[PDB]
Design a protein around this ligand. Structure first.
Ligand SMILES: CC(=O)O[C@H]1C[C@@]2(C)[C@@H](C[C@@H](O)[C@H]3[C@@]4(C)CC[C@@H](O)[C@@H](C)[C@@H]4CC[C@@]32C)/C1=C(\CCC=C(C)C)C(=O)O
Ligand SMILES: Nc1nc2c(ncn2[C@@H]2O[C@H](COP(=O)(O)OP(=O)(O)O)[C@@H](O)[C@H]2O)c(=O)[nH]1
Lengths: 673, 141, 62
């Protein structure tokens, strides 16, 4: 029974730079349609059969662009929202590159045409010049700012005027304003020329002076959008309510259905990585991608999944091929217009959520157990900022682990580990505003009382002076039998990192002054003292010890007596050897626009960052600097402030250098206190 | 050539490749390609001997094309070439680095009068006398 | 109570829902309960093909 063709499905993302107006445009959509959300659209003139629009509203911030990446990958088409005043933003370029990576056929909506400085054609030219795109206006704005009244449809060559009294639910077709007729004819010719380029037949008609029909123009522009050759540009502004309705008609006319998109690539679970495809059909084996996990207070884990092939029912044991885990599907609903119609028939093209999946993560493939496939995996970027989180109480201690676990499950770009040296819980994320939201959820949804600090710098200990002839004599001949042990050691610094063990032991015992059986106990006594340095109780590194002189007693000498002597000798020698506190240094790489370059280093200089050099790149300059871990905290948001949000840094542990005398001494004193 | 707004005289070498990292300086608050440079210098490299950094300029025209201003390995690095002792700068007056004859520069001043442009071959000799003592040299026949 | 960790190397991170079983080790006074290395936070332990039921390892590949 032919019900609603999958060719009527529009799986679309609304994507924009932070602060551009995209969910208000979506709220306008829901109002006009009748209502991840499903909506139904029949056209602003009711000229279309009912189309199913599944909308994913993607975050504007770059701290949550990981969600945008997941969405773009799982979606068919996109609506790119631009501010008429601000135009193409640095963050728009990031989202634009992500949509290019996934080849998402997309259109453009120039919103905020009611604000001061609104300029449609300026934004069209910025899409061309900054994004390297081919923008083709479908519409022209009638007026600007407070004088924005409507739009010209360049396909129909008519003005669209929306009724302000019904919030734009009704519209009239008018003749083009007399001051715009010349400009409308110019852009109409540019639109027809852009349509004619879609095929040799349409190019011949156009060059022959034959007028293209509205159906040929629409079909030709659709083909090129699907090929990602052009971007169709629409305009309009809500509040007075304009554009959205005609942008929704452009979604029907020009954006892909699930059958217009290439088959999804995957790998067979045969151990040979055999390539396979899944076509957008109900008659194919079931395959779906889990793309979002949300924690719900009432139903537990919601796993959002997009079906690409086949059909599944609410309550169907499928196979999580990625995690090799048979997962019985839970309760599955669907946002049928306003209601949440529980669907027991998730067909190809549909987006739904399952309740109570246990071993499913974002990026997992859910498939038919009799036809295993792994759909292509999501690569998750490495976290760029880390902070220490400490529980206030012991109740908060266990609760913290639980809360952070849930947050790491729903958001892969969020990492949590315990630092083995500090025993602090370290949390890491895709920016500090990202970490701020994570902390807020932890101390609200889960209400876990925690302090936010900085990852403790891994302080080390070493000497800066050879000391010779250091006597250690454990002579405890008391309490029954005596315990005699006597060693003489030299202590000397090693070059930093010259020994992968951080420690050298030289046995230079001559004359059997110490029996060879006790020499391992002396070394073990030193190695235990290396774990807790005599200066501040940090591990001692980059040190050599030569045992060359010693003495035993035939009855009273013990293995651990010589280990006690070794510790005495070590503690006395270490204090004489001018002990110092060490530091880690981090190799930092910053990518920035050439005009923002200066600011980056100004701050890095205050952060004790020894700028090694620079590699002027295409974006601008790739500056390299040696910056202490202590000064590499809170840099994500600071960089975002200096560079207006167009810079990305990386950092790696470089080497164990010497902390500046001031820094080292200050910490030594604080630790002693 | 063009205005001094697309002016950085640079290029210590050609085989070290990229003139953007430390090796090649500048490339800051200016904006231009980097591999689009040494290819015209690749038809130009094999006349210059290495160890002799030649000053050329990234002169960018108004239509995105840029080539260089061929000069000549100059005063400074030829006294690290024709004498045989490198930079060592700072000590003209402390200890003896090297004395250079009168005619040892005049034979390469004809090469250096295509590098230095005040007037003449003889007239540029007393500025080969310049940076030599800043490198630390002394000069007498 | 104080529990005991079986196997020879765990997968622990100090906040981990682990399961408890009876049994006194006779060697640590005050440790009276074993853990299960096959249940809920301790997977099939490393490098073992015999008595797989204890320490929870599944049967090997072939
Ligand atoms: C608008 C949109 O679609 O994004 C929204 C949606 C958003 C990403 C929200 C920030 C944050 O709560 C998000 C988390 C991680 C919060 C914790 C979990 O419940 C996740 C399952 C959830 C996903 C979506 C959500 C609810 C957004 C914002 C807020 C807008 C303000 C800024 C900083 C510009 C965002 O963009 O950062
Ligand atoms: N006047 C006017 N205001 C708008 C328009 N679109 C959005 N806004 C306002 O701008 C704010 C941002 O909208 P939102 O959709 O949250 O932006 P997003 O962050 O891009 O999703 C909202 O509070 C809206 O009231 C518009 O077309 N006209």
């Amino acid at each position: 029974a032919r019900t609603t063709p999958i060719a009527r499905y529009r799986n679309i993302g609304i994507s924009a730079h932070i602060d551009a107006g995209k969910t208000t445009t979506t709220e306008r959509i829901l109002f006009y349609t009748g209502v991840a959300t499903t909506a139904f659209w029949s056209g602003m003139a009711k000229q279309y059969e009912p189309h199913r629009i599944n909308i994913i509203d993607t975050p504007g911030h770059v701290d949550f662009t990981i969600e945008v990446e997941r969405s773009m990958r799982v979606l068919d088409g996109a609506v790119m929202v631009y501010c008429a005043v601000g135009g193409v933003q640095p963050q728009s370029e990031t989202v634009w590159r992500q949509a290019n990576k996934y080849k998402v056929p997309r259109i453009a909506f120039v919103n905020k045409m009611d604000r001061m400085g609104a300029n449609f054609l300026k934004v069209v030219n910025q899409i061309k010049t900054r994004l390297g795109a081919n923008p083709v206006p479908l519409q022209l704005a009638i007026g600007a700012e407070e004088h924005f009244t409507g739009v010209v449809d360049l396909v129909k060559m008519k003005a669209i005027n929306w009724n302000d009294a019904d919030q734009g639910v009704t519209f009239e077709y008018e003749d083009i304003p007399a001051d715009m007729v010349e400009l409308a004819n110019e852009w109409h010719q540019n639109l027809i020329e852009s349509a004619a380029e879609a095929s040799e037949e349409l190019m011949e008609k156009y060059l022959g002076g034959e007028e293209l029909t509205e159906a040929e123009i629409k079909g030709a522009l659709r083909q090129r959008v699907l090929n990602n050759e052009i971007i169709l540009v629409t305009c309009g502004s809500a509040f007075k309510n304009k554009g959205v309705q005609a942008m929704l008609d452009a979604v029907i006319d020009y954006l892909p259905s699930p059958v217009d998109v290439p088959a999804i690539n995957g790998i067979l679970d045969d151990g040979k990585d055999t390539p396979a495809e899944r076509h957008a059909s109900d008659d194919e084996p079931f395959s779906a991608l889990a793309f979002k996990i949300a924690t719900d207070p009432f139903v537990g884990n919601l796993t959002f999944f997009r079906v690409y092939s086949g059909v599944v029912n609410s309550g169907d044991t499928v196979l999580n091929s990625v995690k090799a885990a048979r997962e019985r599907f839970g309760r599955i609903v669907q946002m049928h217009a306003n209601k949440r119609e529980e669907i027991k028939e998730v067909r190809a093209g549909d987006i739904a959520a399952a309740i109570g999946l246990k071993d499913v993560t974002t990026g997992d493939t859910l498939c038919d157990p009799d036809a295993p496939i792994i759909l292509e995996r999501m690569e998750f970027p490495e976290p760029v900022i880390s902070i220490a989180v400490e529980p206030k109480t012991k109740a908060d201690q266990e609760k913290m682990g639980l809360a952070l676990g849930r947050l790491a499950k729903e958001d892969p770009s969020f990492r949590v580990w315990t630092d083995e040296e500090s025993n602090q819980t370290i949390i890491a994320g895709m920016g500090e505003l990202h970490l701020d939201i994570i902390v807020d959820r932890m101390k609200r949804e889960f209400n876990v009382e925690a302090n936010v600090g900085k990852p403790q710098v891994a302080y080390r200990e070493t000497i800066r002076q050879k000391v010779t002839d250091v006597e250690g004599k454990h002579a405890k001949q008391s309490g029954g039998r005596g315990q005699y042990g006597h060693v003489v050691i030299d202590m000397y610094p090693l070059e930093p990192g010259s020994n992968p063990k951080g420690y050298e032991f030289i046995n230079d015992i001559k004359g059997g002054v110490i029996p060879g059986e006790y020499i391992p106990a002396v070394d073990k006594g030193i190695q235990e003292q290396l774990k807790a340095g005599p200066l501040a109780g940090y591990p001692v590194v980059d040190m050599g010890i030569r045992l060359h002189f010693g003495s035993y007693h035939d009855v009273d000498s013990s293995e651990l007596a010589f280990k006690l002597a070794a510790s005495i000798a070590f503690k006395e020698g270490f204090k004489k050897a001018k002990p110092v506190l060490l530091e880690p240094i981090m190799k930092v790489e910053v990518e920035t626009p050439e005009e923002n370059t200066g600011d980056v280093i100004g701050d890095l200089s205050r952060r004790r960052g020894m700028l090694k050099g620079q590699e002027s790149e295409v974006t601008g300059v790739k500056i390299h600097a040696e910056v202490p871990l202590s000064e590499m905290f809170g840099y994500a948001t600071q960089l975002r402030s200096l560079t207006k949000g167009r810079a990305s840094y990386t950092m790696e542990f470089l080497k164990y250098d010497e902390a500046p005398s001031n820094v080292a001494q200050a910490v030594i004193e604080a630790r002693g206190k | 050539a063009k205005k001094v707004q697309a002016y950085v005289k640079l290029q210590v070498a050609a085989g070290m490749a990229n003139p953007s990292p430390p090796v090649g300086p500048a490339l800051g608050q200016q904006g231009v390609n980097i591999m689009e440079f040494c290819k015209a210098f690749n038809a130009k490299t094999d006349s210059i001997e290495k160890g002799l950094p030649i000053p050329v300029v990234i002169t960018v025209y108004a239509d995105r094309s840029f080539t260089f201003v061929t000069k000549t390995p100059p005063a400074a690095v030829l006294l690290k070439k024709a004498a045989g002792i490198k930079s060592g700068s700072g000590k003209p007056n402390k200890d003896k680095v090297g004395k250079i004859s009168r005619a040892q520069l005049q034979e390469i001043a004809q090469t250096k009068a295509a590098d230095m442009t005040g007037a003449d071959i003889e007239a540029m000799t007393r500025s080969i006398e310049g940076t030599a003592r800043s490198m630390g040299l002394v000069v007498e026949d | 109570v104080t529990s005991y960790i079986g196997g020879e190397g765990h997968n622990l991170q100090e906040h981990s829902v682990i399961l408890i079983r009876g049994g006194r080790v006779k060697d640590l006074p005050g440790v009276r309960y074993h853990t299960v290395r096959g249940a809920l936070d301790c997977s099939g332990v490393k490098d073992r093909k015999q008595a797989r039921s204890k320490y929870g390892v599944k049967r090997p590949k072939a």
